[PDB]
């Protein structure tokens, strides 16, 4: 059990000690001093006509016609902490809502350009990125994107969730909160 | 349930670390504090958060 | 391309065994559920829409303030549950 090559440097005099703090790698005595110097899952079906409705509605209509869209994700994400965080969740910590909401905002801040787009929607993003580059400001997709694509976003997470090497009860909790949002949007059909 | 610990593992490849989740991991103990036999890199915040969550869960009973 | 940049940056000869995302969590805040999929966002090329036929100092202060806010919210929800009970 030594941070350096296993054998204080054993087998040496006392005037060689050093106890500084740096990176520590064992590597089996550097492969035994280089051989002694070289010998010397899917979302449940509850109210899912919406996906087949907007699947054919993006071929020619792209589900949005106004560039400064009045629908924003900030307000519908703020209502989560004021409506069902104090109602459905058990008493305790609101981490399972607030942490996921912050992660969702950070994911939406960079999800554009890597899938989740259609050809005319790609042209829409291209035109907004040229029109937003005239003042060298960062592109915030919160004020100019609707909440319609949030359902397709949370539907396109699950098959890439298992694409990385990570544990299963994480998937269980992820689909648990996915069930929570679909329960939330069961009655909120106007949004 | 007995849970007779796991009596530690040497610094070879058997000792595997993967910190992913801090709330509701249900890792049955066997943790260590940082600033197969699965162990998590737990910290003060995660232990204190899950302890508070459990005591707020149990206070109905 | 993003895959070209990933191949020319890491996949060629540098940090193949060492995980770049290992020290990612030391500077990122308010992201805990998914961190492994954020690293390999350039290793996969994008594609068009398809559908299957089946269908730490400042971070410590920030999390301390978040914990204080959640404690006040827990007190408020305790008041709410004793009111509704």
């Amino acid at each position: 059990l030594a941070f350096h090559g296993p054998l204080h440097y054993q087998g040496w005099k006392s005037s060689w000690d050093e106890w500084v703090g740096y990176d520590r790698i064992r590597a089996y005595n550097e492969e035994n001093i280089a051989m002694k110097k070289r010998l010397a899952l899917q979302i449940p079906i509850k109210l899912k006509s919406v996906l087949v409705d907007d699947w054919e509605y993006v071929t020619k209509d792209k589900k949005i016609c106004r560039l400064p869209a009045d629908v924003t994700v900030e307000m519908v994400l703020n209502k989560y902490e004021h409506e069902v965080s104090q109602e459905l969740e058990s008493p305790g910590s609101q981490s399972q809502l607030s942490e996921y909401c912050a992660g969702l905002k950070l994911y939406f801040d960079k999800c554009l350009g890597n899938m989740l787009l259609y050809r005319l929607e790609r042209l829409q993003y291209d035109e907004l990125l040229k029109k937003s580059s005239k003042d060298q400001k960062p592109l915030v997709p919160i004020r100019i994107y609707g909440a319609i694509h949030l359902l397709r976003l949370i539907s396109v997470l699950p098959e890439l969730i298992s694409s990385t090497t990570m544990d299963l009860q994480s998937c269980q909790l992820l689909i648990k909160q996915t069930e929570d949002f679909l329960v939330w949007l069961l009655m909120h059909v106007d949004e | 349930k007995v849970w007779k610990k796991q009596r530690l593992i040497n610094k070879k490849n058997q000792l595997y670390y993967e910190p992913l989740q801090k709330i509701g991991y249900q890792n049955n103990g066997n943790i260590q504090i940082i600033p197969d036999f699965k162990i998590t890199q737990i910290d003060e915040n995660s232990i204190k958060y899950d302890f508070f969550d459990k005591i707020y869960k149990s206070k109905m009973v | 391309c993003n895959e070209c940049k990933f191949k020319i940056f890491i996949n060629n000869s540098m940090a193949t065994l060492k995980k770049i995302e290992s020290n990612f969590i030391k500077q990122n805040n308010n992201v805990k559920i998914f961190a492994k999929l954020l690293f390999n966002i350039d290793s996969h090329n994008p594609k068009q829409f398809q559908l299957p036929n089946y269908i730490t100092q400042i971070d410590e202060n920030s999390i301390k303030y978040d914990f204080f806010d959640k404690i006040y919210k827990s007190k408020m929800v305790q008041k709410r549950k004793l009111f509704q009970f």
Side-chain angles (χ1 to χ4, degrees), chain C residues 4-18:
Chain C
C4 319
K5 293 179 179 179
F6 177 80
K7 293 179 179 179
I8 211 79
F9 185 45
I10 293 162
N11 231 359
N12 265 11
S13 70
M14 149 151 289
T16 307
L17 183 61
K18 182 67 173 65

Side-chain angles (χ1 to χ4, degrees), chain A residues 16-51:
Chain A
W16 266 299
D17 287 293
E18 194 85 8
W19 305 83
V20 312
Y22 283 132
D23 76 315
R24 307 166 184 268
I25 36 174
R26 201 238 310 271
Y28 187 66
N29 215 293
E30 293 178 350
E31 217 72 282
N32 195 31
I33 197 50
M35 322 303 198
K36 297 176 181 178
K37 199 318 190 183
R38 298 178 185 172
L39 197 65
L41 179 71
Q42 63 183 358
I43 169 180
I45 311 167
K46 191 66 72 67
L47 202 47
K48 307 349 190 173
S49 298
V50 190
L51 52 98

Side-chain angles (χ1 to χ4, degrees), chain A residues 51 55 86 91-92 94-95 98-99 102-103 106-107 110 113-115 117 152 160 164-166 173-174, chain C residues 29-34 36-38 41 46-51 55 66 70 73-74 76-77 81:
Chain A
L51 52 98
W55 160 260
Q86 314 308 288
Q94 291 94 355
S95 270
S98 174
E99 178 36 59
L106 295 174
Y107 212 46
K110 65 81 173 183
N114 291 336
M115 322 70 78
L117 40 64
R152 97 184 50 190
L160 51 78
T164 183
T165 59
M166 73 84 242
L173 63 72
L174 272 148
Chain C
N29 87 304
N30 258 278
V31 170
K32 318 297 143 161
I33 322 295
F34 32 90
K36 262 128 184 71
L37 49 66
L38 304 175
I41 212 58
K47 55 181 171 61
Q48 83 165 357
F49 211 36
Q50 85 289 299
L51 212 56
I55 324 170
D66 182 292
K70 262 157 199 153
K73 293 305 120 167
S74 316
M76 158 285 153
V77 86
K81 67 207 201 206

Side-chain angles (χ1 to χ4, degrees), chain A residues 159-176:
Chain A
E159 92 300 342
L160 51 78
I161 277 174
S162 295
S163 181
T164 183
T165 59
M166 73 84 242
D167 87 282
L168 284 102
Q169 67 59 47
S170 63
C171 328
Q172 151 161 339
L173 63 72
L174 272 148
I175 66 110
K176 156 39 199 283

Side-chain angles (χ1 to χ4, degrees), chain A residues 2 21 34 41 59 67-68 75 79 89 92 97 111 128 145 160 169:
Chain A
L41 179 71
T59 54
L67 271 81
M75 155 45 67
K79 294 165 81 283
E89 255 82 8
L97 315 98
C111 66
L128 58 104
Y145 219 94
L160 51 78
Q169 67 59 47

